[PDB]
DNA sequence: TGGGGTGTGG
C-alpha cells in the first residue's frame, strides 16, 4: 500500500519526521549518496534539504516575502499489510521489520528511475529520507515508512528541481501519481517474496493484489480503517474517505510503550489466536521445504 | 496533483 502526500513546509514538518519496537531514519537514493549522506538523518541537515539548502554548495531556495519560499518535496508512505505489522510487533518476528525495509528500498529505487528535471530530462537520482513508524493514530500496530523525497535532483552540473515550473510536460511527481499502483504493487511484491520464504503463507484480500497472512486476526487491529468506514461508510468514494481519514483522525499521541504492548497482547488473546503456534507453523513450513527437493 | 486500504501524510 503506497499513499502519497505533498510536503508544504520545511522547518515545521521538518521536525515531524525527526521524532515502539526498539526505535532508524536512514538516507537513500543516488542523490543522497552524492551529497555524501548515509543511514542517519540530522534534524538540521534534513530540515535544510527541504528549504533547498543541500549539504553541498547549493542553495536553491526562494526565501522571499517574510517566509514564502521553496517547495519542500513529497512523502511516499508505504504501509505494510496488517498481518505483517502484527507478527513483527506482537509476534516478535524481527525478520519482518527487515523484509518490509527491503521491500521499500526496492520500490523507492524504482521511483528513482522517474527522477527527472525541468528544461523534461530523466536525471535518474533523488535525495530521500526514510522514516519508519509502527502505529496508527488509533494506537495500533501499523508499520510504515515515509519515504520523503526532497524537491531536488541533479542534472548535468548543479542541482535543479524535480517539481516543475508550469504545465509543459508531466514532470516527476506527475508520473508517480500516475504510477501509484505499480509502486505500492512492487513494494508489496517484494515484501511478499521474503515473507513467504520465511515460511509464512499469504492470500489476496483486496484490489491490486493486496494481501495478508491467512488466519491472523487482522480485523481486530484495523481501528482507524473501521472508524473511517463507520463514518462515511462502505462504497464511499476515495475522496470522501480522504476527508473522513482526516476528521476522525486522532491527534499524534504519547503512548506508554509497555501499557500499549500489553493492551495489544491482551486484545490479541480474545481473538483466540495462537501467535506462537503460527510462527512455528511458518518455520516448519519453511524448514519443511528447504529440506526437500 | 490519482487513487487499493492495513489509512499515513505541517
Ligand atoms: Mg507516520
PDB file of C-alpha atoms (C1' of nucleotides) and ligand atoms in Angstrom:
ATOM      1  CA  UNK A   1       0.000   0.000   0.000  1.00  0.00           C
ATOM      2  CA  UNK A   2       1.622   3.202  -1.238  1.00  0.00           C
ATOM      3  CA  UNK A   3      -0.013   6.524  -0.407  1.00  0.00           C
ATOM      4  CA  UNK A   4       1.125   9.984  -1.479  1.00  0.00           C
ATOM      5  CA  UNK A   5       1.323  13.405   0.113  1.00  0.00           C
ATOM      6  CA  UNK A   6       2.806  16.829  -0.589  1.00  0.00           C
ATOM      7  CA  UNK A   7       5.241  18.292   1.949  1.00  0.00           C
ATOM      8  CA  UNK A   8       4.424  22.021   2.153  1.00  0.00           C
ATOM      9  CA  UNK A   9       6.689  23.252   4.972  1.00  0.00           C
ATOM     10  CA  UNK A  10      10.297  22.555   5.970  1.00  0.00           C
ATOM     11  CA  UNK A  11      11.151  23.712   9.496  1.00  0.00           C
ATOM     12  CA  UNK A  12       7.714  22.750  10.784  1.00  0.00           C
ATOM     13  CA  UNK A  13       7.211  19.368   9.140  1.00  0.00           C
ATOM     14  CA  UNK A  14      10.986  19.075   9.202  1.00  0.00           C
ATOM     15  CA  UNK A  15      10.564  18.131  12.842  1.00  0.00           C
ATOM     16  CA  UNK A  16       7.536  15.845  12.463  1.00  0.00           C
ATOM     17  CA  UNK A  17       9.693  13.051  10.965  1.00  0.00           C
ATOM     18  CA  UNK A  18      12.636  13.694  13.290  1.00  0.00           C
ATOM     19  CA  UNK A  19      10.509  12.249  16.106  1.00  0.00           C
ATOM     20  CA  UNK A  20       7.721   1.352  19.804  1.00  0.00           C
ATOM     21  CA  UNK A  21       9.846  -1.717  18.998  1.00  0.00           C
ATOM     22  CA  UNK A  22      13.396  -0.504  19.603  1.00  0.00           C
ATOM     23  CA  UNK A  23      13.272   2.698  17.560  1.00  0.00           C
ATOM     24  CA  UNK A  24      16.300   4.135  12.046  1.00  0.00           C
ATOM     25  CA  UNK A  25      15.503   7.030   9.675  1.00  0.00           C
ATOM     26  CA  UNK A  26      18.164   6.479   7.002  1.00  0.00           C
ATOM     27  CA  UNK A  27      19.011   8.401   3.816  1.00  0.00           C
ATOM     28  CA  UNK A  28      18.592   6.773   0.394  1.00  0.00           C
ATOM     29  CA  UNK A  29      18.976   7.343  -3.342  1.00  0.00           C
ATOM     30  CA  UNK A  30      21.860   8.098  -5.726  1.00  0.00           C
ATOM     31  CA  UNK A  31      21.309  11.754  -4.901  1.00  0.00           C
ATOM     32  CA  UNK A  32      21.633  11.280  -1.140  1.00  0.00           C
ATOM     33  CA  UNK A  33      24.859   9.426  -1.937  1.00  0.00           C
ATOM     34  CA  UNK A  34      26.333  12.284  -3.992  1.00  0.00           C
ATOM     35  CA  UNK A  35      25.785  14.801  -1.170  1.00  0.00           C
ATOM     36  CA  UNK A  36      27.530  12.191   0.947  1.00  0.00           C
ATOM     37  CA  UNK A  37      24.680  11.126   3.251  1.00  0.00           C
ATOM     38  CA  UNK A  38      24.178   7.741   4.931  1.00  0.00           C
ATOM     39  CA  UNK A  39      21.884   5.898   7.343  1.00  0.00           C
ATOM     40  CA  UNK A  40      21.292   8.798   9.706  1.00  0.00           C
ATOM     41  CA  UNK A  41      19.243  11.951   9.248  1.00  0.00           C
ATOM     42  CA  UNK A  42      20.274  15.014  11.196  1.00  0.00           C
ATOM     43  CA  UNK A  43      17.265  17.117  12.186  1.00  0.00           C
ATOM     44  CA  UNK A  44      19.132  20.173  10.879  1.00  0.00           C
ATOM     45  CA  UNK A  45      20.622  18.836   7.638  1.00  0.00           C
ATOM     46  CA  UNK A  46      17.214  17.409   6.748  1.00  0.00           C
ATOM     47  CA  UNK A  47      15.251  20.492   7.815  1.00  0.00           C
ATOM     48  CA  UNK A  48      17.609  22.273   5.411  1.00  0.00           C
ATOM     49  CA  UNK A  49      17.306  19.896   2.482  1.00  0.00           C
ATOM     50  CA  UNK A  50      13.606  20.820   2.351  1.00  0.00           C
ATOM     51  CA  UNK A  51      14.205  24.562   2.014  1.00  0.00           C
ATOM     52  CA  UNK A  52      16.521  23.846  -0.904  1.00  0.00           C
ATOM     53  CA  UNK A  53      19.762  24.096   1.069  1.00  0.00           C
ATOM     54  CA  UNK A  54      21.739  20.986   0.081  1.00  0.00           C
ATOM     55  CA  UNK A  55      24.803  19.863   2.129  1.00  0.00           C
ATOM     56  CA  UNK A  56      26.783  20.719  -0.993  1.00  0.00           C
ATOM     57  CA  UNK A  57      27.303  24.324  -2.092  1.00  0.00           C
ATOM     58  CA  UNK A  58      23.746  24.565  -3.420  1.00  0.00           C
ATOM     59  CA  UNK A  59      21.171  26.997  -2.007  1.00  0.00           C
ATOM     60  CA  UNK A  60      18.207  26.548  -4.376  1.00  0.00           C
ATOM     61  CA  UNK A  61      15.730  28.362  -2.114  1.00  0.00           C
ATOM     62  CA  UNK A  62      13.463  31.390  -2.541  1.00  0.00           C
ATOM     63  CA  UNK A  63      13.435  32.931   0.955  1.00  0.00           C
ATOM     64  CA  UNK A  64      11.277  35.866  -0.151  1.00  0.00           C
ATOM     65  CA  UNK A  65       8.223  37.596   1.349  1.00  0.00           C
ATOM     66  CA  UNK A  66       8.833  37.042   5.057  1.00  0.00           C
ATOM     67  CA  UNK A  67       8.551  33.265   4.946  1.00  0.00           C
ATOM     68  CA  UNK A  68       7.402  32.350   1.428  1.00  0.00           C
ATOM     69  CA  UNK A  69       9.920  30.005  -0.184  1.00  0.00           C
ATOM     70  CA  UNK A  70      10.750  26.761  -1.995  1.00  0.00           C
ATOM     71  CA  UNK A  71       8.523  23.653  -2.242  1.00  0.00           C
ATOM     72  CA  UNK A  72       9.774  21.044   0.336  1.00  0.00           C
ATOM     73  CA  UNK A  73       9.046  17.884  -1.625  1.00  0.00           C
ATOM     74  CA  UNK A  74       6.923  14.773  -1.331  1.00  0.00           C
ATOM     75  CA  UNK A  75       6.101  11.959   1.060  1.00  0.00           C
ATOM     76  CA  UNK A  76       5.542   8.443  -0.355  1.00  0.00           C
ATOM     77  CA  UNK A  77       4.341   6.324   2.522  1.00  0.00           C
ATOM     78  CA  UNK A  78       4.419   2.576   2.158  1.00  0.00           C
ATOM     79  CA  UNK A  79       2.147   0.907   4.695  1.00  0.00           C
ATOM     80  CA  UNK A  80       2.619  -2.794   5.454  1.00  0.00           C
ATOM     81  CA  UNK A  81      -0.128  -5.440   5.472  1.00  0.00           C
ATOM     82  CA  UNK A  82      -1.746  -5.630   8.915  1.00  0.00           C
ATOM     83  CA  UNK A  83      -0.678  -9.265   9.437  1.00  0.00           C
ATOM     84  CA  UNK A  84       2.946  -8.332   8.754  1.00  0.00           C
ATOM     85  CA  UNK A  85       2.574  -5.461  11.198  1.00  0.00           C
ATOM     86  CA  UNK A  86       1.125  -7.713  13.912  1.00  0.00           C
ATOM     87  CA  UNK A  87       3.603 -10.569  13.502  1.00  0.00           C
ATOM     88  CA  UNK A  88       6.530  -8.190  13.747  1.00  0.00           C
ATOM     89  CA  UNK A  89       5.312  -6.303  16.839  1.00  0.00           C
ATOM     90  CA  UNK A  90       3.059  -8.837  18.549  1.00  0.00           C
ATOM     91  CA  UNK A  91       4.776 -11.923  17.197  1.00  0.00           C
ATOM     92  CA  UNK A  92       8.223 -10.527  17.818  1.00  0.00           C
ATOM     93  CA  UNK A  93       9.382 -11.593  14.351  1.00  0.00           C
ATOM     94  CA  UNK A  94      12.067  -9.005  13.623  1.00  0.00           C
ATOM     95  CA  UNK A  95      12.776 -10.671  10.313  1.00  0.00           C
ATOM     96  CA  UNK A  96       9.624  -8.897   9.062  1.00  0.00           C
ATOM     97  CA  UNK A  97      10.586  -5.327  10.013  1.00  0.00           C
ATOM     98  CA  UNK A  98      13.536  -6.190   7.771  1.00  0.00           C
ATOM     99  CA  UNK A  99      11.616  -7.622   4.842  1.00  0.00           C
ATOM    100  CA  UNK A 100       9.443  -4.536   4.932  1.00  0.00           C
ATOM    101  CA  UNK A 101      12.548  -2.338   4.845  1.00  0.00           C
ATOM    102  CA  UNK A 102      13.997  -4.251   1.895  1.00  0.00           C
ATOM    103  CA  UNK A 103      10.631  -4.091   0.143  1.00  0.00           C
ATOM    104  CA  UNK A 104      10.727  -0.297   0.481  1.00  0.00           C
ATOM    105  CA  UNK A 105      14.313   0.052  -0.683  1.00  0.00           C
ATOM    106  CA  UNK A 106      13.307  -1.904  -3.754  1.00  0.00           C
ATOM    107  CA  UNK A 107      10.270   0.284  -4.507  1.00  0.00           C
ATOM    108  CA  UNK A 108      11.893   3.624  -3.670  1.00  0.00           C
ATOM    109  CA  UNK A 109      14.640   2.580  -6.130  1.00  0.00           C
ATOM    110  CA  UNK A 110      12.151   2.064  -8.975  1.00  0.00           C
ATOM    111  CA  UNK A 111      10.775   5.517  -8.211  1.00  0.00           C
ATOM    112  CA  UNK A 112      14.235   6.961  -8.706  1.00  0.00           C
ATOM    113  CA  UNK A 113      14.043   5.931 -12.367  1.00  0.00           C
ATOM    114  CA  UNK A 114      11.367   8.625 -12.837  1.00  0.00           C
ATOM    115  CA  UNK A 115      13.709  11.203 -11.292  1.00  0.00           C
ATOM    116  CA  UNK A 116      13.740  13.976 -13.912  1.00  0.00           C
ATOM    117  CA  UNK A 117      14.261  17.732 -14.069  1.00  0.00           C
ATOM    118  CA  UNK A 118      12.666  20.695 -15.769  1.00  0.00           C
ATOM    119  CA  UNK A 119      14.219  22.009 -19.006  1.00  0.00           C
ATOM    120  CA  UNK A 120      11.915  17.104 -19.387  1.00  0.00           C
ATOM    121  CA  UNK A 121      15.032  15.007 -18.750  1.00  0.00           C
ATOM    122  CA  UNK A 122      15.304  11.792 -16.728  1.00  0.00           C
ATOM    123  CA  UNK A 123      18.075  12.662 -14.263  1.00  0.00           C
ATOM    124  CA  UNK A 124      17.927   9.262 -12.532  1.00  0.00           C
ATOM    125  CA  UNK A 125      18.666  10.449  -8.960  1.00  0.00           C
ATOM    126  CA  UNK A 126      16.900  11.512  -5.765  1.00  0.00           C
ATOM    127  CA  UNK A 127      17.790  12.627  -2.261  1.00  0.00           C
ATOM    128  CA  UNK A 128      15.447  10.903   0.190  1.00  0.00           C
ATOM    129  CA  UNK A 129      14.841  10.461   3.882  1.00  0.00           C
ATOM    130  CA  UNK A 130      13.093   7.264   5.028  1.00  0.00           C
ATOM    131  CA  UNK A 131      11.440   7.333   8.437  1.00  0.00           C
ATOM    132  CA  UNK A 132       9.925   4.203   9.991  1.00  0.00           C
ATOM    133  CA  UNK A 133       6.920   4.124  12.347  1.00  0.00           C
ATOM    134  CA  UNK A 134       4.786   1.283  13.735  1.00  0.00           C
ATOM    135  CA  UNK A 135       1.454   2.662  14.907  1.00  0.00           C
ATOM    136  CA  UNK A 136      -1.724   4.218  13.591  1.00  0.00           C
ATOM    137  CA  UNK A 137      -3.161   7.393  15.082  1.00  0.00           C
ATOM    138  CA  UNK A 138      -5.531   4.923  16.707  1.00  0.00           C
ATOM    139  CA  UNK A 139      -2.555   3.428  18.510  1.00  0.00           C
ATOM    140  CA  UNK A 140      -2.467   0.033  16.832  1.00  0.00           C
ATOM    141  CA  UNK A 141       0.269  -1.905  15.029  1.00  0.00           C
ATOM    142  CA  UNK A 142       0.660  -0.143  11.692  1.00  0.00           C
ATOM    143  CA  UNK A 143       4.255  -0.409  10.487  1.00  0.00           C
ATOM    144  CA  UNK A 144       5.044   2.014   7.629  1.00  0.00           C
ATOM    145  CA  UNK A 145       7.836   4.075   6.071  1.00  0.00           C
ATOM    146  CA  UNK A 146       7.629   7.702   4.996  1.00  0.00           C
ATOM    147  CA  UNK A 147       9.950   7.841   2.001  1.00  0.00           C
ATOM    148  CA  UNK A 148      10.325  11.624   1.970  1.00  0.00           C
ATOM    149  CA  UNK A 149      11.650  12.761  -1.392  1.00  0.00           C
ATOM    150  CA  UNK A 150      13.476  16.092  -1.384  1.00  0.00           C
ATOM    151  CA  UNK A 151      12.445  18.517  -4.129  1.00  0.00           C
ATOM    152  CA  UNK A 152      15.874  18.297  -5.745  1.00  0.00           C
ATOM    153  CA  UNK A 153      17.655  16.205  -8.371  1.00  0.00           C
ATOM    154  CA  UNK A 154      20.993  16.559 -10.123  1.00  0.00           C
ATOM    155  CA  UNK A 155      21.138  17.173 -13.867  1.00  0.00           C
ATOM    156  CA  UNK A 156      24.352  17.911 -15.790  1.00  0.00           C
ATOM    157  CA  UNK A 157      26.148  20.164 -13.336  1.00  0.00           C
ATOM    158  CA  UNK A 158      24.323  21.627 -10.347  1.00  0.00           C
ATOM    159  CA  UNK A 159      21.086  20.633  -8.622  1.00  0.00           C
ATOM    160  CA  UNK A 160      17.750  21.589 -10.107  1.00  0.00           C
ATOM    161  CA  UNK A 161      14.191  20.859  -9.041  1.00  0.00           C
ATOM    162  CA  UNK A 162      12.078  17.767  -9.686  1.00  0.00           C
ATOM    163  CA  UNK A 163       8.953  19.858  -9.251  1.00  0.00           C
ATOM    164  CA  UNK A 164       8.087  21.738 -12.396  1.00  0.00           C
ATOM    165  CA  UNK A 165       7.582  25.365 -13.434  1.00  0.00           C
ATOM    166  CA  UNK A 166       4.261  25.401 -15.255  1.00  0.00           C
ATOM    167  CA  UNK A 167       2.403  22.683 -17.188  1.00  0.00           C
ATOM    168  CA  UNK A 168       4.817  21.866 -20.048  1.00  0.00           C
ATOM    169  CA  UNK A 169       5.278  18.093 -19.854  1.00  0.00           C
ATOM    170  CA  UNK A 170       4.404  15.800 -16.940  1.00  0.00           C
ATOM    171  CA  UNK A 171       7.337  16.003 -14.564  1.00  0.00           C
ATOM    172  CA  UNK A 172       8.364  13.650 -11.778  1.00  0.00           C
ATOM    173  CA  UNK A 173       5.525  13.626  -9.249  1.00  0.00           C
ATOM    174  CA  UNK A 174       3.004  13.590 -12.113  1.00  0.00           C
ATOM    175  CA  UNK A 175       4.244  10.129 -13.132  1.00  0.00           C
ATOM    176  CA  UNK A 176       4.472   8.985  -9.535  1.00  0.00           C
ATOM    177  CA  UNK A 177       0.716   9.565  -9.088  1.00  0.00           C
ATOM    178  CA  UNK A 178       0.099   8.073 -12.482  1.00  0.00           C
ATOM    179  CA  UNK A 179       2.132   5.095 -11.279  1.00  0.00           C
ATOM    180  CA  UNK A 180       0.944   4.652  -7.645  1.00  0.00           C
ATOM    181  CA  UNK A 181      -0.490   1.184  -8.048  1.00  0.00           C
ATOM    182  CA  UNK A 182       2.677  -0.153  -9.678  1.00  0.00           C
ATOM    183  CA  UNK A 183       4.801   1.215  -6.848  1.00  0.00           C
ATOM    184  CA  UNK A 184       2.593   0.055  -3.997  1.00  0.00           C
ATOM    185  CA  UNK A 185       2.402  -3.029  -6.104  1.00  0.00           C
ATOM    186  CA  UNK A 186       6.116  -3.844  -6.390  1.00  0.00           C
ATOM    187  CA  UNK A 187       6.721  -2.824  -2.803  1.00  0.00           C
ATOM    188  CA  UNK A 188       4.051  -5.337  -1.825  1.00  0.00           C
ATOM    189  CA  UNK A 189       5.568  -7.937  -4.119  1.00  0.00           C
ATOM    190  CA  UNK A 190       8.999  -7.646  -2.585  1.00  0.00           C
ATOM    191  CA  UNK A 191       7.650  -7.934   0.944  1.00  0.00           C
ATOM    192  CA  UNK A 192       5.665 -10.910  -0.356  1.00  0.00           C
ATOM    193  CA  UNK A 193       8.664 -12.858  -1.718  1.00  0.00           C
ATOM    194  CA  UNK A 194      10.585 -12.654   1.545  1.00  0.00           C
ATOM    195  CA  UNK A 195       7.600 -13.207   3.842  1.00  0.00           C
ATOM    196  CA  UNK A 196       6.767 -16.446   2.078  1.00  0.00           C
ATOM    197  CA  UNK A 197      10.440 -17.505   2.122  1.00  0.00           C
ATOM    198  CA  UNK A 198      10.435 -17.104   5.916  1.00  0.00           C
ATOM    199  CA  UNK A 199       7.685 -19.712   5.774  1.00  0.00           C
ATOM    200  CA  UNK A 200       4.584 -17.542   6.046  1.00  0.00           C
ATOM    201  CA  UNK A 201       1.542 -18.008   3.858  1.00  0.00           C
ATOM    202  CA  UNK A 202      -0.342 -15.165   2.136  1.00  0.00           C
ATOM    203  CA  UNK A 203      -3.608 -14.773   0.245  1.00  0.00           C
ATOM    204  CA  UNK A 204      -5.110 -11.881  -1.678  1.00  0.00           C
ATOM    205  CA  UNK A 205      -7.733  -9.873   0.154  1.00  0.00           C
ATOM    206  CA  UNK A 206      -8.040  -6.618  -1.781  1.00  0.00           C
ATOM    207  CA  UNK A 207      -7.633  -4.834  -5.082  1.00  0.00           C
ATOM    208  CA  UNK A 208      -4.378  -4.772  -6.977  1.00  0.00           C
ATOM    209  CA  UNK A 209      -3.273  -7.862  -5.095  1.00  0.00           C
ATOM    210  CA  UNK A 210      -3.314  -6.512  -1.567  1.00  0.00           C
ATOM    211  CA  UNK A 211      -2.749  -9.452   0.800  1.00  0.00           C
ATOM    212  CA  UNK A 212      -2.405 -10.737   4.366  1.00  0.00           C
ATOM    213  CA  UNK A 213      -1.299 -13.884   6.158  1.00  0.00           C
ATOM    214  CA  UNK A 214      -4.356 -16.161   6.378  1.00  0.00           C
ATOM    215  CA  UNK A 215      -5.649 -16.774   9.893  1.00  0.00           C
ATOM    216  CA  UNK A 216      -4.107 -13.730  11.598  1.00  0.00           C
ATOM    217  CA  UNK A 217      -6.849 -11.638  13.389  1.00  0.00           C
ATOM    218  CA  UNK A 218      -6.405  -8.521  11.244  1.00  0.00           C
ATOM    219  CA  UNK A 219      -9.913  -7.169  11.716  1.00  0.00           C
ATOM    220  CA  UNK A 220      -9.071  -6.652  15.395  1.00  0.00           C
ATOM    221  CA  UNK A 221      -6.209  -4.233  14.715  1.00  0.00           C
ATOM    222  CA  UNK A 222      -7.758  -2.091  11.993  1.00  0.00           C
ATOM    223  CA  UNK A 223      -9.329   0.526  14.260  1.00  0.00           C
ATOM    224  CA  UNK A 224      -8.642   3.520  12.013  1.00  0.00           C
ATOM    225  CA  UNK A 225      -9.856   1.801   8.874  1.00  0.00           C
ATOM    226  CA  UNK A 226     -13.133   0.827  10.568  1.00  0.00           C
ATOM    227  CA  UNK A 227     -13.757   4.201  12.212  1.00  0.00           C
ATOM    228  CA  UNK A 228     -13.325   5.718   8.712  1.00  0.00           C
ATOM    229  CA  UNK A 229     -15.901   3.357   7.210  1.00  0.00           C
ATOM    230  CA  UNK A 230     -18.400   3.616  10.093  1.00  0.00           C
ATOM    231  CA  UNK A 231     -18.500   7.328   9.276  1.00  0.00           C
ATOM    232  CA  UNK A 232     -18.652   7.811   5.501  1.00  0.00           C
ATOM    233  CA  UNK A 233     -19.416   4.106   5.146  1.00  0.00           C
ATOM    234  CA  UNK A 234     -18.569   1.416   2.648  1.00  0.00           C
ATOM    235  CA  UNK A 235     -18.965   2.079  -1.091  1.00  0.00           C
ATOM    236  CA  UNK A 236     -17.766   5.584  -0.256  1.00  0.00           C
ATOM    237  CA  UNK A 237     -15.567   7.271  -2.857  1.00  0.00           C
ATOM    238  CA  UNK A 238     -11.824   7.515  -2.305  1.00  0.00           C
ATOM    239  CA  UNK A 239     -12.075  11.291  -1.960  1.00  0.00           C
ATOM    240  CA  UNK A 240     -14.808  11.063   0.692  1.00  0.00           C
ATOM    241  CA  UNK A 241     -12.731   8.621   2.673  1.00  0.00           C
ATOM    242  CA  UNK A 242      -9.799  11.076   2.458  1.00  0.00           C
ATOM    243  CA  UNK A 243     -11.774  13.645   4.433  1.00  0.00           C
ATOM    244  CA  UNK A 244     -13.058  11.016   6.856  1.00  0.00           C
ATOM    245  CA  UNK A 245      -9.490   9.855   7.317  1.00  0.00           C
ATOM    246  CA  UNK A 246      -8.678  13.398   8.414  1.00  0.00           C
ATOM    247  CA  UNK A 247     -11.679  14.300  10.637  1.00  0.00           C
ATOM    248  CA  UNK A 248     -11.943  11.148  12.725  1.00  0.00           C
ATOM    249  CA  UNK A 249      -8.150  11.138  12.799  1.00  0.00           C
ATOM    250  CA  UNK A 250      -6.992  11.288  16.405  1.00  0.00           C
ATOM    251  CA  UNK A 251      -4.020  13.584  17.132  1.00  0.00           C
ATOM    252  CA  UNK A 252      -0.441  12.367  17.479  1.00  0.00           C
ATOM    253  CA  UNK A 253      -0.115  10.511  20.773  1.00  0.00           C
ATOM    254  CA  UNK A 254       2.407   9.830  23.552  1.00  0.00           C
ATOM    255  CA  UNK A 255       1.963   6.150  24.372  1.00  0.00           C
ATOM    256  CA  UNK A 256       3.339   4.186  27.261  1.00  0.00           C
ATOM    257  CA  UNK A 257       5.176   1.544  25.226  1.00  0.00           C
ATOM    258  CA  UNK A 258       4.533  -1.281  27.703  1.00  0.00           C
ATOM    259  CA  UNK A 259       0.965  -0.286  28.643  1.00  0.00           C
ATOM    260  CA  UNK A 260       0.139  -0.404  24.937  1.00  0.00           C
ATOM    261  CA  UNK A 261       2.106  -3.535  24.084  1.00  0.00           C
ATOM    262  CA  UNK A 262       0.090  -5.174  26.863  1.00  0.00           C
ATOM    263  CA  UNK A 263      -3.280  -3.896  25.608  1.00  0.00           C
ATOM    264  CA  UNK A 264      -2.416  -5.475  22.251  1.00  0.00           C
ATOM    265  CA  UNK A 265      -1.285  -8.811  23.637  1.00  0.00           C
ATOM    266  CA  UNK A 266      -4.451  -8.743  25.726  1.00  0.00           C
ATOM    267  CA  UNK A 267      -6.766  -7.860  22.846  1.00  0.00           C
ATOM    268  CA  UNK A 268      -4.761 -10.365  20.818  1.00  0.00           C
ATOM    269  CA  UNK A 269      -5.835 -13.206  23.118  1.00  0.00           C
ATOM    270  CA  UNK A 270      -9.592 -12.617  22.867  1.00  0.00           C
ATOM    271  CA  UNK A 271      -9.428 -13.322  19.143  1.00  0.00           C
ATOM    272  CA  UNK A 272      -8.408 -16.850  20.052  1.00  0.00           C
ATOM    273  CA  UNK A 273      -5.239 -16.575  18.036  1.00  0.00           C
ATOM    274  CA  UNK A 274      -2.148 -18.561  18.957  1.00  0.00           C
ATOM    275  CA  UNK A 275       0.727 -16.269  17.964  1.00  0.00           C
ATOM    276  CA  UNK A 276       3.460 -18.778  18.873  1.00  0.00           C
ATOM    277  CA  UNK A 277       1.810 -21.700  17.079  1.00  0.00           C
ATOM    278  CA  UNK A 278       1.725 -19.526  13.954  1.00  0.00           C
ATOM    279  CA  UNK A 279       5.424 -18.592  13.894  1.00  0.00           C
ATOM    280  CA  UNK A 280       6.300 -22.236  14.438  1.00  0.00           C
ATOM    281  CA  UNK A 281       3.784 -23.387  11.808  1.00  0.00           C
ATOM    282  CA  UNK A 282       5.538 -20.944   9.484  1.00  0.00           C
ATOM    283  CA  UNK A 283       9.003 -22.177  10.472  1.00  0.00           C
ATOM    284  CA  UNK A 284       8.052 -25.816   9.948  1.00  0.00           C
ATOM    285  CA  UNK A 285       6.631 -24.743   6.590  1.00  0.00           C
ATOM    286  CA  UNK A 286       9.885 -23.048   5.602  1.00  0.00           C
ATOM    287  CA  UNK A 287      12.030 -25.755   7.136  1.00  0.00           C
ATOM    288  CA  UNK A 288       9.942 -28.466   5.534  1.00  0.00           C
ATOM    289  CA  UNK A 289      10.834 -27.297   2.018  1.00  0.00           C
ATOM    290  CA  UNK A 290      14.399 -26.020   2.112  1.00  0.00           C
ATOM    291  CA  UNK A 291      14.998 -29.623   3.239  1.00  0.00           C
ATOM    292  CA  UNK A 292      13.276 -31.431   0.369  1.00  0.00           C
ATOM    293  CA  UNK A 293      13.971 -31.392  -3.422  1.00  0.00           C
TER     294      UNK A 293
ATOM    295  C1'  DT B   1      -1.844  16.823  -8.496  1.00  0.00           C
ATOM    296  C1'  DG B   2      -4.613   9.892  -8.587  1.00  0.00           C
ATOM    297  C1'  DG B   3      -6.377   6.516  -6.311  1.00  0.00           C
ATOM    298  C1'  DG B   4      -6.138  -0.345  -3.379  1.00  0.00           C
ATOM    299  C1'  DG B   5      -6.589   0.419   2.469  1.00  0.00           C
ATOM    300  C1'  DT B   6      -3.724  -2.005   6.747  1.00  0.00           C
ATOM    301  C1'  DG B   7      -5.281   4.834   6.424  1.00  0.00           C
ATOM    302  C1'  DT B   8      -0.378   7.667   6.905  1.00  0.00           C
ATOM    303  C1'  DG B   9       0.806  12.411   5.383  1.00  0.00           C
ATOM    304  C1'  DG B  10       2.711  20.514   8.959  1.00  0.00           C
TER     305       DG B  10
HETATM  306 MG1  LIG C   1       3.954   8.033  10.287  1.00  0.00          MG
END
